[PDB]
Amino acid sequence: MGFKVKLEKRRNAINTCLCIGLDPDEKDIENFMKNEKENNYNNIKKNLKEKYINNVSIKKDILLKAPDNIIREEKSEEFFYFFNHFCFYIINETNKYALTFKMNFAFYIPYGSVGIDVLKNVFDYLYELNIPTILDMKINDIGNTVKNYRKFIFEYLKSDSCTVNIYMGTNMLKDICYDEEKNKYYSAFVLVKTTNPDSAIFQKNLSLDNKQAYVIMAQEALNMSSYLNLEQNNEFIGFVVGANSYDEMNYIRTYFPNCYILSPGIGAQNGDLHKTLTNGYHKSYEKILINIGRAITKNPYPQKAAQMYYDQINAILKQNM
């Protein structure tokens, strides 16, 4: 059924709220290319033994080839092959510690179409493993236009959820989280308080009747969730609250006690894991997803990086229990 149910069931199976961010940059892909040479393509060889590699949509034949053969006979496909295999490696190494994976669209678009094929294969692979997914694309537009993102994200990729910037207004959510024609409902996290250094400029400095913009925005997002009856349908509108934004995390959790929060900003952005999880804590802890991207994906051994975040999260979750 809904994302609410998928998250709950996965939390029951793995007992964490780690969200692993999969945001590969050019340097990471090139590094993977290089390491794999030095290592006799060990990680790619592992990827090929996994069963679900056989269920991805795009250029499967290419993906199943030996690296040595790709490099000589399918050179034009080398970037595709190593990019896709980088993502498969990270997933295969870390999925056992992940409540959910968040892929930031920005990392999949800058080479043109090739990265979108990779992104589709990444979502196919996670769907097959039944791991909850988030597309972080911060979508926003008028209703007629945004329906195309609903199609891309929820029908093409079959994502469970996405991120949305509702500064234009909340009506867009009607065309992102709801498909009237098909009677389908989808989940989204709206930007509330972000991690960038100048985030106060509009999110805090603007207000409406003694409340900061971020509170107004959170409240209006939940009002739209209500109008749509999302939770009735096991889907939700939640909040992106920065892991370096303790006061706001604390406020949001206090005043919206049962909201779903997605919290990026730990690791590469120096956010604080203990404070973030303590301030956003909920006993149904799928309601406080702690996103870790670069601190895992730019680590020579991502499994060990994932494991340590998993263990620390779990030790903090017990403290708060």
Ligand X SMILES: Nc1cc(=O)[nH]c(=O)n1[C@@H]1O[C@H](COP(=O)(O)O)[C@@H](O)[C@H]1O
Q: Which residues bind ligand X (CB under 6 A)?
A: 21, 23, 104, 136, 141-142, 145, 163, 194-195, 240, 242, 264-265, 267-269, 291-295
Burial class (CB in 10 A: 0-12, 13-18, 19+), 8: middle
Per the annotation, does 141 bind a ligand? Answer: yes
Longest dimension (CA), the chain: 66
Binding string to a second copy for residues 117 to 136, with x set by CB under 8 A, is what? x--x----------------
Per the annotation, does 104 bind a ligand? Answer: yes
Q: Does 170 interact with a second copy (rule: CB under 8 A)?
A: yes
From the candidates 138, 174, 204, 298, which is the catalytic residue? Answer: 138
Q: Does 263 interact with a second copy (rule: CB under 8 A)?
A: no
Q: Which of 60, 151, 158, 304 binds a second copy (CB under 8 A)?
A: 151
Strand partners, 100: 19
Per the annotation, does 212 bind a ligand? Answer: no
- Phi/psi of residue 107, each to 5°? -80, -15
* Distant-in-sequence contacts of 223-231, Cβ < 8 A, 24+ apart: 223/170, 224/170, 224/171, 224/173, 224/174, 225/173, 225/177, 227/174, 228/173, 228/174, 228/177, 228/178, 228/185, 230/177, 230/178, 230/185, 230/187, 231/4
Per the annotation, does 293 bind a ligand? Answer: yes
Subset of residues 218 to 247 that bind a second copy, contact rule: CB under 8 A: 220
Per the annotation, does 25 bind a ligand? Answer: no
Distance CA(97)–CA(311), nearest Å, equals 9
**Which two structure tokens, joined as six digits, stand for 234?**
């096991």
Subset of residues 62 to 81 that bind a second copy, contact rule: CB under 8 A: none
Let me know if 138 is a catalytic residue.
yes
Residue 292: name its binding partner from a second copy, ligand X, none (Cβ under 5 to 8 Å by kind).
ligand X
Report the residue number, 106 or 315, with the smaller CB distance to a second copy.
Answer: 106
Report the residue number, 47 or 163, with the smaller CB distance to a second copy.
Answer: 163
Distance CA(2)–CA(159), nearest Å, equals 12
User: CA end-to-end span of the chain, whole Å?
Assistant: 28
Q: Which residues are tagged catalytic? A: 138
Binding site for a second copy (CB under 8 A): 23, 25, 58, 104, 106-107, 109-114, 116-117, 120, 138-146, 148-149, 151-152, 155-156, 165-172, 191, 194-203, 205-208, 213, 216-217, 220, 268-269
